[model samples]
Target chain A: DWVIPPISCPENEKGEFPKNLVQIKSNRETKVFYSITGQGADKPPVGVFIIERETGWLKVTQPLDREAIAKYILYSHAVSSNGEAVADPMEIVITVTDQNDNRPEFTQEVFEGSVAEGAVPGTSVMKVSATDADDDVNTYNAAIAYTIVSQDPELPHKNMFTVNRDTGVISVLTSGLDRESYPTYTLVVQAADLQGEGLSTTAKAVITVKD
Target chain B: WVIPPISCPENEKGEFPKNLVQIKSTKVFYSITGQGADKPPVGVFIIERETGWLKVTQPLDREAIAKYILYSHAVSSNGEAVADPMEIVITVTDQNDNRPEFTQEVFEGSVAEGAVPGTSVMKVSATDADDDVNTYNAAIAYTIVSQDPELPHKNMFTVNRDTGVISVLTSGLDRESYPTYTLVVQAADLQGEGLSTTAKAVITVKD
Candidate 1:
């Protein structure tokens, strides 16, 4: 018996369906048929994988969407022409690697937040969140970063607010939130996936300084 | 993130050291560290030093406590942290060990002789030690298994599945034909399939 490594497939790039994945070898001379079944092959997300009946070459049928599903567990078996299984069924794990095909989506289109007037610096006003429809376990693929792109009516300074790049928590940086000077303020928040190196999306956050 | 909850039975000894989980280390020589293992409140669970096999010391009581949360970490033998701390939960499973107990040994009720078919006679209640919050483990259903005399019919009464309310189904309740009746009520858990216990009730009809 030999150890089989997991199968890896990239997301979204394809022409031929069922592209050959792996090859099986046997010393016996009897004719054997190859069959594979399970999650992506015969169950949900069906028809994603197929095996060449004669050569035992497993192939992918079409492009994959990692957001819908990230991994598939399949069972493979070799049977004789008479429908008798020659060897025990073996499990194959197929993992879909991440790709920069999806943009980070904010949880809210326009986040409504408030801060008390004359609040001290570093006071947390609100927390904004965004979700990426990509595999987050993979290195830096689905990791999201947040930033305050622009501030409307740049009050006293352009750096009135600060946002944690990793946590998406927006806090007041300068102690100058005055209800008399400016009753409300708007901020453009941007979210970028792939550790801030991939696709990005933006949303608006309205902050009302309460007296 | 929290790991999946572990399930174990109550009141266990070392004879069947139910291994709850096995902590793994990415580094080969790293050892395991855990809270509630070599610390206080540690009388029930322990982990093997070399193998990292978490074992329960004794059987648990579901009524006393439902679950326990233990924190674990992977550290090198020399006392350096190797992995982040993790939490493990052990949930005590319900067994059909406890019998249904009635509030009183005997229950007495009176009804009119010419009572209507749907007349509310009385209600029987029971309590079980098993967990009843969720799952059918503690869900109790009542049944009038036996009657003293099979008067007009074998089944003269019915019970509510959810409320355990017993009502008269037959109206031919003549004091002379039957002045008194004794009924055996059964309370069962797991939708009345797994474990069951019985109680007695006495009904007296007045003319």
Candidate 2:
């Protein structure tokens, strides 16, 4: 008859096993035993959640991984001492909140890009991408931002290129790319999660200036 | 006790004016004179005057009408207003009933004769009629079902499920041998196991 809100737990938390999430109680005070069985309980992922039959307290035995499994729906039953049903089975919902545990890794180990000599300023070379296998894809957790960390030989300028933070497209900053002066340029690029603030990973992009 | 609104499946097939639910306690007269109550003007529901039972007059089309807002009135035996008028909303749930359709009847793309493998040739996209944005009912996946002149290689193209970008799978493009390749592509909704529709792609290998 009453609505039960979903029990939210932060995913990938460092904690001791068998951490208490919440408690389930019966309306009747007379010796009620609580039992739970469902997707996270006695279901496929068995034993992630266990309930204290005597005290009606629910606890988790392992760290919840959002990348592996995010949501769990289980059924809780209240019973008397003799197993007579106290009431209808109630629903228990568990949501594993997202945590920034994944770092954005480059899609390629070495991004091989090319550009014509005497290229115009802001000329497109190619696109570089990194992906994070985490939740909140539209927001912070999986959002990736790219930056050119280092440029080789510092020809004409130390910063010869710029990467679009959101789009990951590499563009030439200055019109000074010469095949004679520099046959190839190796740029160390960094991809950072949390919109360039959380976790960081790096890759090398070798841009060949074609004659 | 307040009865919950009816959320039935769309395209529900049954007898006309099928009794769906009752709104209240009895000995009271109930009537629905709501917006759709009139042919009852293509309304889906009609109320039983004395019994107070609400019935669906016909099968519902979600694309046609997603929901029905009903206005119910109750009166005493003396024909006097016994209770306040109630407003009810009946929602139609979604089903994987629509096929994915390509935006273009025949998608056109091209690539250079000696283009490197994994180079993006072009993109093809499709749309689904199941408008539920949250479920996979409208989720679509693309596949190149068949290729004419399956030469140079059997699988000459690959389509990404995420962006639907078509890329060259092999480096066997000789404009002289096969100038144009016709590809039969499939777009499947419900993530490629449900309803599917096929379209053609004419890719030219340019010099």
Candidate 3:
């Protein structure tokens, strides 16, 4: 069995870590066997810090890591297992979490596409297909946008094309053309967002005119 | 000249006797020395017993006919001219009077080249301007001019001589060679130019 660590977290503002950490014995059993109260080596030390009401394991809900208390609670706990009075206790430590670090990526190495010259509103122009190595559900970091970075001659419907915030489906907002007037055009497009539509990472695609 | 009575003559129907008789008794000359108180008849005279009119028993002699003369000769108890112009008045009578006529004034006719027998190529009509007492003068006859030398019978037209109605007696017409012909329609008085004026018809032969 293990109990909470007695060492203090110096960088902690809250003077403690998050929750207890859990533990298990070497018995190879899977069922809950015993109960505990918090106890450990702090000045008052700690009481039984973890409980295993089925199989008599021990754990703490927090950690002693100073690297975590700088940002959050890093609590340590002491625990009893086997349902016996403590002849000796064990400790567990917990640590806080940090933000993700990986950048956004595109699914294709060289995406290729074409569009009819005079596509109308709601017509799809180009779609950006991308993936993020980080969890997509994170609210602050994983969102994206597909947008025109540059276009030839500063076209009339400059912002007329759109990309679905989630789907990345690039579509025309307006269109009417004589191909002779604008026989060809190229668009420099990039994808960016902050967790969603802003404050996120970005990438680019080069759209070339053909035929 | 005297017409001596050699045989007794019978008078025909509607006879009228001579009205008078005068005799040329002699060829005598008068002495120009006398101035008579009256003129004398130089010829002898006899009156017709039937009509009490005078005539010459002998034809008038050369000295009794004159325009006007004065007599220095003996008279037969009447005044008359005694000198003559010496010309005879024979008193020859005339019997026949006739008028000229036409064969046809407007003769309508046609002729086809190489026409067959009995083709009425030409027809004749005549007119008389004279009255009935001279009806024989109006009777006209038709005859052809002299025949052509090349085709002697080419002028083969005939006519009812008395009626002056002419027709094509035969037709051997050659329109190309003899496309037209001129027929002089001969209109003679019944006596053949003996009694009245003679006329002709101008006939044209057309294809």
Candidate 4:
């Protein structure tokens, strides 16, 4: 079997090597190395995740397929001591392509946004905003659909919060928030393209209930 | 003839006979009668613990004096019954009487004397001892509490209710005549006329 070089480790964790690591921010750059173990094996051709050294941030250089390029691994040719061959290890997964260069994030890390104790269905509760690093065309991006991950069963909105795909304005789609009975709600929102394409690139916002 | 009673179900099960018990903080509210039992009633409550509701989460509300009840349950009969014969009272201790103190005790904010009436001059702010109840009301209200007549200063400061941003309402302030005028700010609650407070800011005419 082929023995691939391990991932890079922080100076302190030199012993516990890190392999196939990917950071989402652009300003945080990392130096990674890979080695080939098979005797006649040559170095693996791996690409570097380009980013501004000062700002370890990655700008959307090009549109990406979430399924195809969410993450990738590193690999190399494997050869035995007598120039024989060995099985290659699992693909060294290294992922790239998107960063949180987006701007105008919700002030609260997880917005526990709530409407009145008795909010009618379709009432506007709160709006979430995330910025795209790309300008113009990309700037037009916004939350298209609102999903309810977890909620107070008593006040289930089968479709409670509705998000504006173009503007990210999350509103109460089918309200039934009774503050006395269900004082709070923990909403898990996935803001993505109405087209439903990019999974690795989508952003999530949590809306909480605050009375 | 009166001996300390066992603080539990006089029966051998060691179960709490009463449902209501008092707990203090994260501490186990129940203590056995002189370690007579093995598991010393580790977490069982002799009585339901009074909620330790501290206002640490909310912004400081300085004006309001904190008054809360500190209570616990103890059995005088040596854990015989979960009855709280003695009640502990705790007053929201005060310090320095910091009544809605302002971030800038004596804010010397300046706006151009000729600037338009809507331009912000200085944002008046104050800290409170209360919790979320009056955190929003701490926005110090600025009135020309005391402006020098010689300068003819007419309501030179306007404060935003939500933002605490103070803007110059009336312009043409002369630094020479009104070198500095003391403004008496009253920070009040948005709801009832309770917990109203005052703080002073000397606006030194900075050109």
Model-by-model DockQ, in order: 0.01, 0.01, 0.00, 0.01
Worst 10 residues of 2 chain A by lDDT: A1-10
- For model 3, state the Cα shift of residue B152 in Å: 99
Give the candidate order by descending TM-score: 2, 1, 3, 4
Give stretches of model 1 more than 4 Å off.
Answer: A1-3, B1-207
Q: How would you encode candidate 4's per-residue C-alpha lDDT over B164-204 as one tens digit per residue? A: 67676776777766666666666653222223455565566
Top candidate on DockQ is 2
Candidate 1 per-residue lDDT over residues A1-211, each given as its tens digit: 4224446565554455656566654444579987888988888878889888888778888877777788888988888888888788788877765544566899999999999987889999888899987656434546799999999769877778888999989999997777888888899999987567555789988999998
lDDT of each: 0.72, 0.77, 0.40, 0.39
lDDT of 3 by residue, A81-131 (tens): 544333343333322221222345667644545566656678775677766
lDDT of 3 by residue, B91-195 (tens): 211111223555445454566655676665555655544222312434556666543333436666766666666666775656556544456555554334423
Q: What is the TM-score of each candidate against the true structure?
A: 0.48, 0.50, 0.28, 0.28
True contacts kept of 4: 0.00
Which portions of model 4 show Cα errors greater than 4 Å?
Answer: A1-211, B1-99, B133-144, B190-192
Specify the highest-TM-score model's number.
Answer: 2
* Model 3 misplacement above 4 A: A1-100, A108-110, A177-184, A195-202, A206-211, B1-207
Per-residue C-alpha lDDT of model 4 across residues A1-211, encoded as one tens digit per residue? 3222212211111122222232222111243222332211232222232323232222222223322344434433333444443444334433222221232233344664656645666667776654433222211222233333444443645556667655557777774655666656555555433122221133344444545
User: Across residues B18-46, which tens digit of lDDT does each residue of candidate 2 receive?
Assistant: 76676774368887766568634545678
Total clashes in model 4, counting residue pairs 3 or more apart in sequence or in different chains: 43
Model 2 DockQ reads 0.01
- Residue A37, model 2: lDDT of 85
The global Cα lDDT (0 to 1) of model 3 is 0.40
Q: Which consecutive 10 residues in model 4 chain B have the weakest lDDT in total?
A: B1-10
